[PDB]
Design a protein around this ligand. Structure first.
Ligand SMILES: [Cl-]
Ligand SMILES: [Cl-]
Ligand SMILES: [Cu+2]
Length: 95
């Protein structure tokens, strides 16, 4: 199953407006079947895009509609691997 190895913004780290989130998994994931929910103090923030650029499909680029306002962000992810297995979790970060 796909484990999330690293994010960026990194779990619980603080940053300036990153432009997008990168999620790096232990296996290839499917952009089309994978769900990512980004929320700021408990209301949806709008994701415009999901993509796996490289061909291993191990980094998921999650592009929000706007650049991100400063504050407290919760990511909830439901990955579907290239072999169709479902995993999930969550993490936080701050701008
Ligand atoms: Cl995980
Ligand atoms: Cl999707
Ligand atoms: Cu597995």
């Amino acid at each position: 199953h796909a484990h999330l190895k690293s994010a960026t913004p990194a779990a619980d780290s603080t940053v300036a407006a990153p432009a997008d989130l990168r999620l790096t998994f232990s296996e290839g994931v499917e952009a089309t079947f994978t769900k990512v929910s980004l929320s700021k103090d408990g209301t949806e923030v709008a994701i415009k895009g999901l993509e796996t650029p490289d061909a291993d499909k191990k980094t998921l680029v999650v592009t929000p509609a706007a650049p991100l306002a400063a504050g407290n962000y919760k990511v909830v992810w439901n990955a579907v691997s290239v072999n169709t297995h479902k995993s999930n979790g969550e993490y936080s970060f701050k701008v």
